[PDB]
Design a protein around this ligand. Structure first.
Ligand SMILES: Cc1cc2nc3c(=O)[nH]c(=O)nc-3n(C[C@H](O)[C@H](O)[C@H](O)COP(=O)(O)O)c2cc1C
Ligand code: F3S
Lengths: 1468, 116
């Protein structure tokens, strides 16, 4: 996939531009996915100017007289199956064009060639025609284009109003034309022969090649759109489309006129994210604004509170963020007006973009640098684009505007500093208002009314107000789901949070908080198509949580303009009291809004022993959706109080449904009460309140960053959740667009539970709060999955070999009431039973078992080694985990055991990853998430990092380690296909297995991963354990694995891809019935997991995050490690018993093997609980069976899936003397951009031959000419040397371990070294050792997670040396923003010429100073000498010449943790 | 030890047969036969008196400090049949190497080319 643009600076039409564009299209096939036949693709397109002379000559050939004014051309896709529909469509187009009085010159049928397109994309091929229109009335060009836009909107409306499907107007104008289709990107010029004619000449060309995620294609969904060409994916589409629907009611302009009433539905139905983005973009451009301004207003720059930006751009950004909410996510946009051509980035800087300027005034930009060929003697400036940057070209004036110049030219239009001064931020308001009590009986009464317990309350509330942070659980939750409980559970238990796995990555919270905004505006909505300082007259808040003081301040501010509404309903009402109460509050708030009141306040302080309270979630949802459906939400800012809000998840779900601010008064009352008794000690009330507010804000920021959103202004009302256990009618009526695949309880059960809880609370004089059993176990209630009796019975059965005891254990486990979805099922069969002996061998089903890995840093190495020994003995496969592994474990034992593993994880931390560590395995594993924490990543507490784990992870002892949540090299599925390519390259005998987490809509990602040359999917439920995680993450995330497994199997079978990838599930498996059900749903491999741990000593103590586990499993100290009582014989017996039970049940069913049951769902049936009366959970969609056709449901080919070969092959044939004798070698080659991962297979060969450090440095050297592709030198061991002359694309030096890379401009370069870009992004992701000498500016995320490597670069980008752990980085010149954030180990040397470093650096855990000790001075001197010897850079030599005067210009960056542990004192 | 390959990949069988040896013919990939070169096509290679050191004498199995001049004609190539016999011999003694003749450009070389 990729976008690109070629523009001419002067502004003259020519042919070379289109030639270069087609040439760039012809060399992108390496990124896009591949097919089996080679005749179908994902979609391609070009966007150029209109060849006036071509169509003029065409008309002259027809017989007319060509006029002198311009001539507009419109391209239309008509339906092809029928014939009369085409006639009606032509009639529609003609009657809507001739309305304005224009003159038509006729139609034309573009000739195409129908042997290139594959058969799949041919069954839905539309009929392409062109219409030529001309201006006989003689109007200017701007009015002409505006009229054509209005005509296009009218045509689309009048066609949609007749259900004429498959009719699309691609582009209709007099300046631009679009040639797009579903063919391969390479064959474009041989599919549309019109582009072959040399009479097509333009001055700008924009090309796009997308990357689909579904086998079924669609033509109108192929980029580029009319005024845009987007690469990536927009996360906030639901919230944005909702707020656009809100704004649709009051946007007008005298430019359009009456036709404005036609453009009310500004966003159509059935368009992708980029489609809505483009249509809103086109509206805001045609309204009169320019392209850079609307680009700033749609996706602005991160409003930093720093002194890097002058106040001009600050006021500009404030106004931009005041008009319209942003569109977060990864997006590299290349848009164009009729005048401007702009390229721009998003807020964070995820997707790549690179541009180049020639000597003849031609700019070429794209995703990769080597996509167009230019001679070195004509380059002038190779640049890049950081976060929030943009570069524009003006064709009328013929100029090129870079970042700061364009920002200045924008900020010099209107007095933005004066307009932004008419706001009011409510801090001085509460300060001056501060210058201007509930008894414990009713307090406990209400706390019991809302179902709050006592121990579960203080366990989560006191750690919030004590230090300011949140609690930490230690194990997977097996509590029943929200609907299967018998006790009261608030509505917040029914909403599971969302997250993004592969399509777009999450965002870090501790090191990227500068780019996240929690600002809230009140009274700001207005006409977005108007520009005046009236819009910057509003109310400002720093966070949507408000204590009673600030709430009273705002209340006094508003005063008479508010309209407070009740939220209570009579308890003595009939069986339909809640519905009438909802109708009442709806009518009340609507009339209050029509009464001119600009504020609505949802408050339920009217609760007593005679009226019950409505759950505030439902009331807020109903009011919000009604104000949206009545075209009134644009007026009133909703304000809500409640009496239940205690945890961060509640506030998150309450703000996500439509509320603007939430004020929890009862929780503050309880906190003040607990303070008046003296529990915190000496901490005042204000300090406790401040800690509480900070904890809530951090929880909200975590929940936002969970799914890659950085603005609370866009998350509000987005409905980014999933309701499990609710009816479809209710969730579709009283809530925004959400998903509930299975039904649930309706309004009746909610009212019943609320009234029963209220009766238990007030009718009886409750004196003390119950102990509660949600998080921990208690005998009062709150049944769990694991219990004492079950644990003891399992331990006895596994320690005494008594199969009868295991049968009794299984019977005990199955008799319990339904606690999970599958328990609502029952297997059946109509065949005859079969004697048990005919069932396949015990070993044959024992080999279908695995054990999911656990990080070595979490549990003691003894248990890990025991698991590995048992698994390598039984014959199945184990897993190593996330914390690397001991090297000396790579050797067998004298007793017949082996302390090695069979599956290695490559997680988002990359701790012990090394080219060797990826060789002693069979099945690589790429962890993306897990069940206990979807979007947090693995974490390890501070004191659990002993010296052993320190030498294993290449980290610092005693300091905390929290891995980054998002994969720094997986920002889209393109990079994931790239990574799988590299991993299959480094290992020839491995199958790469991806890990996933259940959620809604996982089918798209499933089909994508299947197309991405993967081999084994792994679906995990929400019942997976961990070593350390927040409580909200454990209890309020993920879905049961049954739903996700059914969905992924159905999607993989639907697209005819199931036979090309296996399936595997895990999470909470104990008995044999669950295994048979998983086999029935579509699984093939099963992981048991924590059960094995319980058969080894763990008895569910849940103190693993404190390093004091009693039995000695999850521990890291000496005394507790000696209490281990595990034995591999236990695990052997456990797996034997599981296989035995599976044999027995399968014999009882009436089959003979497992192959006969995998993929069958017609053997299950549903039995319900009639006494509970709840609405029967509609599990029917989980039993949906799609017929497989000819390919078996379980079928899979042998061996890993093949992969094309790179240049490495050509090396391993010409270097065979090295692999046969071991001598020095020097090779030379030309390198194109298409070639990927140059030099990894040779690394694997030399690793198998001589090991990691078997060859002295420089034992084999390779020279590359031109432009290297992606992932240069991935996992290169010591002894290899690569030297490229030119430029590298991206991900260069990933996983470097001992090797050597050298980049340098060729000897004829007229450029300046330290003033251009030479490499890409995320350079040296998690390298261990080696060197990297370059000459030029690097990219963003430069040297992230580096530990041990030595890198020397001349200037870099933002987030430099982020999360470093070791090694040395020497930077020369200017550095980016947010430099060295979260750095823990190592050292950095910066060369500052303007003393700007103290302004960009992050003072979190690093200190910057001057060099004082002669030791470091000599070290840096030697490093610079080596660098200038290697690459012969002139700037380095110039520095070395004036060293005695430059020793003072240098700054040193040292981590805050190595202040004393270093040998030589850094401070004299 | 440093990956340096100091051996020679092409061995010569000249008119002198100075260092030829059963071990010297197996450390190769291709053997070459010398007939004449471009400077001295008739009189064969010569070496001065004061050049030959003790190491040269050990290499060539000779007396130190003596004028060594190679006999012009290959004493075992007196006709083309002798050439064929010598190629048979060389290909017998080395089971995996190639043989190569070395001529000097002159008129009437076509018949010689066809013969070889
Ligand atoms: C103590 C513990 C530590 C774990 N550590 C990791 C880890 O480091 N990386 C990972 O991908 N999964 C980790 N997991 C999750 C397991 O790989 C597996 O997905 C999960 O435990 C299976 O769920 P179960 O507990 O029902 O068997 C861990 C699980 C536990 C209980
Ligand atoms: S709770 Fe965890 S620390 Fe050990 S005793 Fe059980 S596995």
């Amino acid at each position: 996939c990729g976008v690109g643009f070629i523009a001419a600076i002067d502004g003259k039409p020519r042919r070379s531009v289109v030639e270069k564009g087609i040439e760039a299209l012809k060399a992108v096939w390496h990124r896009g996915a591949v097919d089996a036949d080679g005749k179908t693709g994902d979609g391609a397109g070009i966007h150029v100017a209109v060849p006036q002379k071509f169509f003029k000559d065409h008309v002259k050939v027809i017989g007319h007289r060509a006029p002198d004014n311009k001539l507009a051309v419109g391209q239309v896709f008509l339906p092809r199956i029928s014939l009369d529909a085409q006639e009606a469509c032509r009639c529609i187009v003609e009657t809507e064009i001739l309305a304005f009085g224009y003159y038509i010159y006729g139609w034309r049928q573009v000739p195409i060639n129908v042997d290139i397109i594959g058969e799949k994309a041919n069954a839905t091929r539309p009929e392409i025609e062109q219409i030529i229109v001309g201006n006989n009335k003689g109007v200017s060009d701007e009015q002409f284009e505006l009229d054509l836009y209005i005509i296009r909107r009218r045509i689309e409306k009048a066609v949609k109003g007749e259900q004429i499907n498959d009719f699309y107007i691609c582009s209709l104008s007099a300046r631009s034309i679009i040639y797009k289709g579903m063919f391969l990107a390479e064959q474009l010029t041989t599919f549309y022969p019109d582009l072959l004619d040399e009479r097509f000449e333009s001055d700008f060309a924009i090309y796009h090649q997308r990357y689909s995620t579904n086998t079924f294609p669609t033509w109108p969904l192929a980029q580029p759109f009319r005024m845009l060409a987007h690469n990536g994916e927009i996360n906030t589409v639901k919230g944005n489309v909702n707020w656009m629907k809100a704004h649709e009611t009051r946007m007008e302009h005298p430019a359009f006129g009456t036709h404005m009433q036609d453009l009310k539905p500004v966003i159509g139905v059935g368009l992708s994210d980029s489609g809505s983005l483009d249509t809103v973009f086109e509206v805001m451009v045609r309204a009169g604004r320019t392209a850079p301004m609307v680009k700033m207003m749609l996706v602005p720059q991160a409003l930093t509170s720093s002194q890097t930006t002058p106040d001009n751009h600050k006021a500009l950004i404030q106004y931009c963020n005041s008009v319209m909410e942003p569109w977060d996510g990864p997006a590299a946009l290349a848009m164009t007006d009729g005048r401007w051509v702009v390229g721009g980035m998003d807020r964070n800087g995820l997707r790549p973009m690179r541009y180049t300027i020639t000597t003849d005034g031609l700019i070429i930009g794209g995703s990769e640098t080597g996509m167009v060929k230019i001679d070195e003697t004509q380059v002038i400036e190779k640049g890049r684009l950081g976060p929030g940057e943009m570069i524009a070209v003006d064709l009328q004036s013929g100029k090129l505007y870079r970042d700061r110049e364009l920002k200045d030219h924008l900020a010099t239009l209107k007095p933005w500093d004066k307009w932004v001064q008419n706001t009011t931020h409510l801090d001085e308001l509460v300060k001056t208002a501060s210058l201007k009590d509930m008894d414990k009986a009713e307090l406990r009464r209400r706390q019991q009314a809302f179902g709050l317990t006592m121990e579960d309350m203080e366990l989560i509330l006191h750690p919030m107000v004590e230090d300011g942070k949140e609690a930490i659980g230690s194990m997977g939750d097996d509590s029943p789901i929200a609907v299967l409980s018998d006790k009261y559970r608030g509505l917040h238990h029914f909403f599971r949070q969302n997250f993004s796995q592969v399509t777009n990555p999450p965002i870090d919270s501790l090191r990227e908080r500068r780019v996240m905004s929690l600002k809230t505006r009140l009274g700001n909505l207005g006409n977005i198509l108007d520009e005046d300082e009236t819009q910057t007259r509003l109310l400002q808040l720093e966070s949507p949580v408000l204590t009673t003081a600030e709430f009273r301040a705002m209340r006094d501010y508003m005063g008479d303009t508010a309209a407070e509404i009740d939220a209570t309903f009579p308890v003595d009402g009939g069986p339909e009291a809640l519905r009438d109460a909802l109708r009442r509050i709806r009518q009340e708030t609507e009339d209050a809004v029509r009464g001119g009141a600009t504020h609505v306040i949802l408050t339920d302080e009217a609760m007593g022993p005679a009226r019950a309270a409505i759950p505030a979630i439902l009331a807020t949802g109903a009011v919000h959706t009604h104000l949206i459906r009545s075209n009134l939400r644009t007026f009133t800012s909703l304000n809500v109080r409640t009496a239940e809000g205690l945890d961060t998840h509640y506030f998150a779900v309450l703000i996500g449904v439509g509320a603007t601010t939430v004020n929890a008064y009862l929780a503050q009352e309880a906190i003040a009460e607990r303070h008046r008794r003296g529990l915190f000690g000496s901490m005042p009330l204000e300090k406790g309140m401040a800690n509480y507010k900070k904890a809530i804000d951090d929880g909200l920021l975590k929940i936002m960053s969970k799914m890659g959103i950085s603005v609370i202004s866009s998350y509000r009302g987005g409905g980014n959740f999933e309701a499990i256990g609710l009816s479809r009618a209710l969730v579709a009526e009283h809530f925004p667009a959400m998903v509930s695949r299975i039904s649930g309880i309706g309004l009746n059960g909610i009212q019943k539970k609320v009234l029963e809880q209220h009766a238990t609370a007030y009718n009886e004089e409750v004196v003390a709060l119950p102990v509660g059993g949600f998080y921990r176990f208690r005998k009062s209630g709150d049944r769990h999955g694991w219990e004492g009796g079950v644990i003891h019975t399992l331990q006895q059965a596994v320690t005494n070999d008594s199969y009868t005891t295991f049968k009794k254990y299984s019977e005990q486990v199955n008799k319990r009431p339904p606690m999970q979805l599958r328990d609502l099922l029952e297997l059946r069969s109509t065949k005859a039973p079969v004697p048990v002996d005919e069932v396949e061998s015990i070993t044959a089903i024992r080999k279908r078992f695995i054990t999911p890995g656990m990080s070595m840093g979490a549990l003691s190495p003894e248990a890990h080694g025991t698991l590995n020994v048992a698994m390598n003995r039984i014959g199945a496969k184990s897993d190593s985990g996330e914390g690397g592994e001991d090297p000396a474990r790579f050797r067998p034992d004298k007793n017949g055991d082996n302390w090695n593993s069979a599956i290695k994880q490559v997680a988002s931390g990359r701790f012990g990853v090394t080219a060797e560590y990826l060789n002693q395995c069979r099945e690589l594993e790429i962890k993306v998430a897990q069940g206990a924490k979807p979007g947090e990543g693995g974490q390890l507490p501070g004191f659990k990092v002993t010296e052993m784990i320190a030498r294993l992870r290449h980290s610092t002892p005693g300091v905390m380690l929290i891995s980054p949540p998002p994969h720094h090299d997986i920002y889209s599925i393109e990079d994931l296909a790239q990574l799988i390519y590299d991993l299959k390259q480094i290992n020839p005998d491995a199958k790469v297995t991806v890990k996933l987490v259940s959620r809604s809509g996982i089918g798209t990602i499933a089909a994508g991963v299947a197309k991405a040359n993967a081999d084994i999917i792994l679906i995990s439920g929400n019942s997976g354990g961990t070593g350390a995680s927040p409580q909200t993450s454990i209890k309020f995330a993920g879905l049961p694995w049954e739903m996700g497994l059914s969905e992924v199997h159905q999607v993989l079978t639907l697209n005819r891809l199931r036979h090309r990838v296996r399936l595997r599930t895990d999470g909470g498996l104990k008995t044999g019935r669950d295994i048979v059900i998983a086999a029935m749903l579509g699984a093939e491999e099963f992981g048991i997991g924590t059960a094995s741990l319980i058969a080894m000593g763990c008895i569910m103590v849940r103190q693993c995050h404190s390093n004091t586990c009693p039995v000695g499993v999850c521990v890291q100290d000496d005394k507790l490690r000696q209490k281990f009582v595990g034995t591999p014989e236990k695990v052997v017996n456990l797996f034997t018993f599981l296989a035995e039970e599976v044999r027995e049940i399968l014999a009882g069913l009436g089959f003979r093997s497992l192959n006969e049951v995998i993929g069958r769902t017609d053997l299950l049936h549903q039995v319900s609980r009639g006494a509970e009366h709840l609405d029967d959970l509609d599990l029917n969609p989980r039993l949906a069976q799609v017929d497989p056709g000819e390919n078996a449901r379980y079928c899979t080919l042998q061996g890993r899936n093949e992969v094309p070969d790179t240049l490495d092959a050509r090396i391993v044939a010409d270097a065979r003397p090295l692999f046969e004798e071991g001598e020095k070698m020097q090779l030379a080659y030309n390198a194109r951009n298409t070639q990927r991962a140059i030099g990894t297979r040779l690394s694997s060969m030399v690793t198998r031959k001589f090991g990691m450090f078997g060859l002295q440095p420089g034992h084999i050297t390779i020279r590359l000419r031109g432009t290297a592709g992606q992932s240069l030198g991935a996992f290169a061991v010591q002894g290899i040397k690569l030297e490229v002359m030119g430029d590298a694309n991206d991900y260069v030096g990933k996983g470097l371990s001992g090797g050597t890379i050298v980049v340098r401009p060729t000897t004829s370069s007229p450029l300046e070294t330290n003033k251009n870009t030479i490499i890409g992004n995320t350079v040296l992701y998690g390298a261990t050792a080696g060197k990297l000498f370059a000459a030029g500016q690097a990219g963003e995320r430069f040297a992230v997670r580096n530990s041990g490597a030595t890198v020397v670069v001349e200037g870099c980008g933002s987030n430099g040396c982020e999360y470093m752990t070791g090694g040395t980085a020497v930077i020369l010149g200017r550095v980016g923003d947010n430099f060295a954030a979260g750095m823990t180990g190592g050292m950095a040397y910066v060369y500052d010429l303007d003393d700007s470093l103290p302004l960009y650096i992050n003072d979190e855990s690093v200190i910057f100073q001057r060099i004082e000790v002669g030791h470091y001075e000599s070290q840096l001197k030697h490093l610079i000498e080596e660098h200038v010897t290697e690459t012969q850079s002139r700037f380095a030599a110039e520095i070395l010449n004036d060293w005695a005067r430059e020793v003072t210009k240098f700054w040193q960056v040292v981590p805050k943790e190595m202040l004393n542990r270093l040998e030589v004192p850094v401070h004299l």
